[model samples]
Target: SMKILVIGAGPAGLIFASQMKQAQPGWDISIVEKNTQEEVLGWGVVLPGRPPRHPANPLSYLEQPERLNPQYLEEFKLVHHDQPNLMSTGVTLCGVERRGLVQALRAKCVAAGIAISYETPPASQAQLEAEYDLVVVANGVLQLPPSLAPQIDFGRNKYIWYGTTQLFDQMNLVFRSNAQGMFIGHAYRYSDTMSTFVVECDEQAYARAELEMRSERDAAAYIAKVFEAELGGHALVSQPGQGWRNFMTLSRERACEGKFVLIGDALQSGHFSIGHGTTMAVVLALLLVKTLSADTDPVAALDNFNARALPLAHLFRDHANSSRLWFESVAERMELSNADLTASFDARRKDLPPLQDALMASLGYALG
Candidate 1:
C-alpha cells in the first residue's frame, strides 16, 4: 500500500490522487489546497469531449464527458504553408465551464477517499516532501509553492477568463490590433445560462495598453472600449462590461527536484490562445498516475515520464507558439480573412500526426 500526500486539491492534484488510488486499492491519499472549499472565481475552465490520438490528450486524459455540450465545442485545423502535415497543432480537444468545474473534481476526489485540506496551501518544499512520499504541485500559476517571478514571460496572449450570460452557441473568437496591443476575445457557452469570456493580449500589448492605469471600475470600461475598438464591444454586453480581468504573463518550464514533482501549469505555461492550462494538467496527472503505479526507481521513473512528456510539451507548445506568432503578425490587420490567419477557427483532432512529426524533424520542436 502506498501512502501519498497531494498538494493543491485543484483538479490536477485530486485527479492524480484518484487515479493513484484506483491503481493501487490500498493507497492512502490527501490533498492540501490554498483556497477555501467555496472559493469563487470570475470564471470556469474547460476541456474536450473526446480524447486525441483515439486515446487521450497529452497533459490531459479522456474521461466520461459528464457536463460537456457538443454544440458549443470547436476543432482547429492547421494548414500552414499549404503543407498538409498534422502536428500538435493544438487541434483535438475542446471544453468549457464557469465556476461549476471545481465541484466536479472535488466530488470525484471525495468519493475516491482522497482527503483535502481546504483553505490551506503548502508551506515549504521540505515540509511538502516530509508529509508525502511524493508531492504533486497542483497549485495554479498564481499560488505556486514558490511563485513564478513576474519577470518570466507567460505567453503571447494577455487573457483573463470571465463569466457571462450572453449565449454564444459556438466557440467564438474575435481578433483586433491597435496602438495599445492585440486583443483577442473568446467566448463560448458552457451551459444554457453560463459562458466563459476571455480577453487575450500579447506582452507588447500589455505594456503599450494604458487600460491598466485606471481603477478596476474605470479599467473595465476602458477594456470594453479596447475590445470595441477592434471587435465591436456589443458581443460582451450581456455580461456586465465592468470588472477588470488581471493579466498574467505566459510561460512553460518543467521543474521537479527529488520528491517534489510539479504538475499542471507548473510544467507548462500556456496562453488561453490554445486553452491548454487545465487540459494539460488533467493529461499530465494521468501520465504520472501510470508512471508511479509501480515501484520503479524514482529517478528512472521520472526520466521515463519526461521522455514521454517532453515530446508532448513540445507538441502543444508548438501549436500554441504558432498560434501566438500568427496572431502577432496579423496584429495590425483588420479584414479578418482566412488567408491572413495562421490558426484555424477550431483545434482538436487525431489528424495531427504528420504535423507533429514534421515539427520534430524540422525545428526539433521549434514551431519557428
Candidate 2:
C-alpha cells in the first residue's frame, strides 16, 4: 500500500484524501490541518446544482444532506442603487455554510478511515518527501520553493465578509451609492436564518470611509448602514480574525514536483465574487483522484494530473479575474443607468448564452 500525506484540511485536502482512500482502499492516507476541526474560516460558499461533468462530485460524498443545509437558488436578484425596481435572471446555485461544508467533508474522511490530525504544524516539503510516497499540498498559497514560480495579484477593491440574520430569499446583488462612492452587497441565504453578506468597494471609497483607521466592528457597522435597506435592521456579524482586505489572486506556473502535488487554492485562487473557489477545489480534487487511480506510476500520475488540471484551473481563474475586474471598476460603472449597469454586470462573464443575452436585453429595455 502506498503511504500518502495530505496537507491542509480545507475542501481540497479533505476531499482528495477521502476520495483517494475510497478509490485505493489499500493505500494509507492521513491529513494534517493547521486549524482545529471546529475552526474553519469564512461564512458561506456558493455551489452549483451539478458537478462539472463528473460523477464523483463532492456533493455526493456529503451523505447527510441536512448538514449542508443547502439553499438552492434558481435565479438572482439585481438591485441597482436608487432604483425602486429590481431585475432577476435565471441561475442554478446552492449556498451552504462554509463551516458545514468543511465538517461534512471531514466526516467523510473519518468514515473512510482516514486519520486527520488537527492543530498540527505543517511538515516541510523535504520532510514530507522523505516520509511519504505521495505528498498532496492543498493548503492555500504556501511558501514555495524555487521549483514553482507563483505570481500573486492583489485586487484593487477592498471587501469584507459578514453574515447576517437578514435572510435573503434568493441571491441578491444590491449596489448602493453614497458620498464616499459605491458599495455592493452580495448576499444569499445559506441556511434557515443566516445569509452571507459580502460588501465590496473600490480603493477611493475605502479611503473615503477611512476604514483603515476603523476597527472591524466599526467597518461592519458602517457597511451595515450602507445596505440598511436590504439588511432590514439585522446587524452584520463578523468572524474573528476576518476584516476588510484585498482579494489575492494566486497562480502558479507548475502544479507538481516529483511526488508533491498542489491542488485547490494552493494551485490557484479564484475571486469569491464569482463564487467558484469551492467548486474549483472540489473539481480539482476529484480530477487528481481520478488521475492517480488510473496510473500505476506515481510521478507520471502527478504529471498527468498537472497537465489536465492546469487548463481547467486557468479557465476558471481567467473567468474569475474578469469578474473581479468588473467589480473593481464598479465605481465607474455605477454612473450608468440602472438597466445598463445590470446589463454590464450580467455580461461580465462573457460566456452567457445568446438566449440569456436576449432575455436580459429585453428586460433591460423594459426596465429602462
Q: Of the candidates shown, which would achieve the greatest lDDT relative to the real structure?
A: 2
Question: After superposition, which runs of candidate 1 have C-alpha atoms over 4 Å from their true positions?
Answer: 40-42, 50-71, 74-94, 142-151, 177-182, 202-209, 222-255, 335-339, 342-368
Question: How well does model 1 score by local distance difference test?
Answer: 0.56
Write the residue-wise lDDT of candidate 2 on 1-368 in tens digits.
69998888998999889878888899999998987778888787677664332232356567765556778776677888657434443446777888888888888898899999989975676777789998888887554467776889999998888999998887888888889887988999988889999988978999999989988778788899999888878999888888888999999878887788888898999888888687667777878887887788888888887887777677778888989999988877777888898889878987733323332333232222
CA lDDT, every prediction? Answer: 0.56, 0.79
* lDDT value, candidate 2, whole model: 0.79
The sequence of per-residue lDDT tens digits that candidate 1 reaches over residues 1-368 is 55677777666676677777878778778887777887745564546444423223321222444454323255332322222223342443445453456666677778777788887743766665666676676676633334323234534444555555665545556565666767766766666566666776766776777555655556455566765532344434323443443434344444454666766665665556666566566666777776675436766666666666556755665566655555555564444454444433333223345434532343222111
State which candidate has the highest TM-score: 2
